[PDB]
Amino acid sequence: LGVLRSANYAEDNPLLEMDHKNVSDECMLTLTKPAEQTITYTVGIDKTLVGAYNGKNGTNYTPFPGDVILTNEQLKLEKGKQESSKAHLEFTYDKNLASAIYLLPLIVKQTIYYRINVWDEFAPAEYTTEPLVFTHIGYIDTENMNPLIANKLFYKLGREPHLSYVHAFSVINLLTATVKYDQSGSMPEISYNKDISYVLGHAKKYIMPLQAQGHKVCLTIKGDGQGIGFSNLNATQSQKLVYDIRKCLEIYGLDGVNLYDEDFSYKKEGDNLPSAANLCNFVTALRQAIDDKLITYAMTEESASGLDQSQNGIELGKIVDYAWTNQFNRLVNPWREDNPFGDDSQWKIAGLEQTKFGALTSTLKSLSQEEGELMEGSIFDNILDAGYMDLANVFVVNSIAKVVAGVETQGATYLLWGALINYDVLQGINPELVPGLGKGGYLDIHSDLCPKDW
Amino acid sequence: LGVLRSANYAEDNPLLEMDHKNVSDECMLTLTKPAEQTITYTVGIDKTLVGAYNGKNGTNYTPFPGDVILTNEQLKLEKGKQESSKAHLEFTYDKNLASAIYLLPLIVKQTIYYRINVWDEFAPAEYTTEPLVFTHIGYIDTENMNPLIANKLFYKLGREPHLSYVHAFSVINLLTATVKYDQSGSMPEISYNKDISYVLGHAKKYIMPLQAQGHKVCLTIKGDGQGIGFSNLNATQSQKLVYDIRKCLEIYGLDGVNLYDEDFSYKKEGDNLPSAANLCNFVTALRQAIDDKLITYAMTEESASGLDQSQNGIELGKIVDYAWTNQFNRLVNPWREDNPFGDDSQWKIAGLEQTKFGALTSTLKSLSQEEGELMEGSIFDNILDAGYMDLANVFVVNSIAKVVAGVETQGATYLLWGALINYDVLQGINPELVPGLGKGGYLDIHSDLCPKDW
């Protein structure tokens, strides 16, 4: 009586994702009672167990026909111990392998059923055109990250025989361009660093493949500290910036623009004071020029007061497509009186439906025990206990970043909160980020999923 | 309106047999009306049609994952012609192909649905453990043939969705050993040529693999023209020959012996003359020694008279498991009076049930128009129109031999008569000899299925 168990996967029938490279796992035997005498059991492959697995679990899998290299298959179990040595399995990818899920059973002489997912050129097996239920907006810092990593990130939704895969993000924000004065000191202009220039300059390689995979790709525009910005433009300056943004979006085939309201370094006293009214007039002008292309707003603590009320009849929430904050790893509910976690009323935008507000914008930082309690607490209490279910439609991730030492814990969770609420809590569907675990996955701190190639 | 058809196969859905080697075929377009103008069409692969084929024909096929190399895919149809050029298709075997029957639809962009049977290491896909209805006995001339060709010959039984494969033979007779006088001329001794010595000396390679797939393997023992044989032995000579045969079967893991009563060159007038009583006495002693191992008898014109009668209370038909004749390509009915084909009364063995008698023994020789009419006539009239149904149990093929120029016609027929009667006539099941057609098949006169390797 024992259990052939996977060392690196809690699933009793682990599902490995094979994206044109080899995959591997170690398996071991776990006896119910300690071994009396030292015995050596051997693991072997028994592909004749496929049809029985299929009939029971409703699957239609085919035996994995590629080379499977089992090393240290002699499971030595020392006397007095309950868990044997670890055999190592490496599944070998070959281009002859068709894209599907395969089944390779392993027997001890219990049984562990390994399922291998051979990906197609663009997506894993069982990818569906069924769209994501919520809006997942992701940032990419073009200084450290390839925008095309979004086309390598998927959710594993459901359990067999109803397994489906979808892209983890629906909108991708590209960081960044900036607003600066021209050389003459009169007009604003958009400045592009070397990295954001290469991505835009080769959009058929970086932006257009994302769009073919169902992504809306926007350009984030921030401030460059010269005192000119979205909230203090005059009439002539505004027409310039609206024209340049309109041109930029059509020029490089972008789907919209993200207005990041920070790093403008506005002056506190003078004639060009930043106002919410100016911000409303500017976005209204931008909406007229770019039509149905997306406008999103990233509110910060440097944002102007008065967005809670109408400015000259304009409500910013009515003109923008989405809006979120820089209050990372915390759920911001501006519509909650006597909010136990904190008063988020400064983040109230007039005319903005709760469905257009990313209440949770997450970043890849390590969090304390109190920070983790506040995060999970503000998430569950506002969406489930307080009834603010309309705050589960937009989830924002400020920079999909490389997982390194220290941020491994937050790296596993800061992309799954959107699907956790919408799929696991609000429905029955289990969500899982793919390719996360395993060598070469996103959670491998010694690998890069989609690295920068310029 | 047109028909995409195969040149070498008249079936709409050709079933190609892939046994760890590549398989190929040519196709063409046949228009229902001549080409008004000169046009060129192109053929392609549409694995989406796999589903509708499955639903219509009740199959569970999966699209073929291997590489299909199509050449001349542009079909040139000159004006006034109804048939386009030929396109060549090669289906590539690879170790990454699991054993199954795969479907590969081919479209002109009518449809030709190709079915690929990727064999396992031992049998084609859809091989069944269901045993053969009749007993098919096959000889193998070890001087020209490898005994393991029997592990490559199958019957394709039925139609889809009720397709199955069985081995075409149940008993294999290995030619041959000889009985000669010892140096002093007082004892019989078994003699082995260089080829039959190698087969027995490496029975783990040649005999045992046949028995694993369910073959009963016997050794045929004839005469060497030295005047000593099964029918003139005394008491001391009989014990010696019985001992060495019992020893031979035990030594090489054989399942029985075939007593071929020919080429002994018995004396016409003298002291130790051949008699049917002597033969009955020797076989009775062989039955006691080898016990449940098989004794079979091949009667010839050189066989002794009186086998129709009980010799000293012994009936040879009671001690032998099977019996047949050397009267090739003609059904022999010794129990039928006023036989229109021929009086076969001299081939009658006392106490032999008809279910143990192989009335038809086939050999790979070309037949005249009259000889073929005698063959088909005697087979059909005796078993079906005269009601000798018990003569359909045992069928014999004397030397499964290489098909060459001149015997292509008899090559296709002389292995399927037993299945034609028992499966096609007496049941609804359709029989096909696999792997017969195609390059490398048994009917390819420029290839050897399982050749000699010694």
Residue numbers in the entry:
A (entry chain A), B (entry chain B): 42 to 150, 163 to 507
Text lifted from the article:
We found that PUL16 also encodes another putative GH18 endoglycosidase variant, BT1284. However, this protein contains non-conservative substitutions of both acidic residues in the catalytic site, thereby lacking the canonical catalytic DGxxxDxE motif of bona fide ENGases. By enzymatic activity measurements using complex type glycans (from both animal and plant sources) and HM N-glycans as substrates, we confirmed that BT1284 and one ortholog from Bacteroides faecium (Uniprot ID: A0A6H0KVH8), which we named as B. faecium GH18-like, were indeed catalytically-impaired. The crystal structure of B. faecium GH18-like revealed the presence of a TIM barrel fold typical of ENGases from GH18 family fused to a β-sandwich domain in the N-terminal region (DUF1735), similar to BT3987, as well as a β-hairpin motif common to GH18 enzymes with specificity towards HM N-glycans. Structural surface analysis in the putative glycan binding pocket of this ENGase-like protein, revealed that HM N-glycans do not fit as well as in a bona fide HM endoglycosidases. Together, these data indicate that ENGase(GH18)-like proteins were unable to hydrolyze or bind N-glycans in the assayed conditions, but may they still play a role in the metabolism of N-glycans in HM-PULs from Bacteroidales by some as yet determined mechanism.
B. thetaiotaomicron contains almost 300 different GHs belonging to 60 different GH families, and secretes at least six mannosyl-glycoprotein endo-β-N-acetylglucosaminidases (ENGases, endoglycosidase hereafter) that hydrolyze the chitobiose core of asparagine-linked, or N-linked, glycans (EC 3.2.1.96). Here, we discover an ENGase from the GH18 family in B. thetaiotaomicron, BT1285, encoded in a distinct PUL with its own repertoire of proteins for catabolism of the same HM N-glycan substrate as that of BT3987. Altogether, our data suggest that human gut microbes employ evolutionary strategies to express distinct ENGases in order to optimally metabolize the same N-glycan substrate in the gastroinstestinal tract.
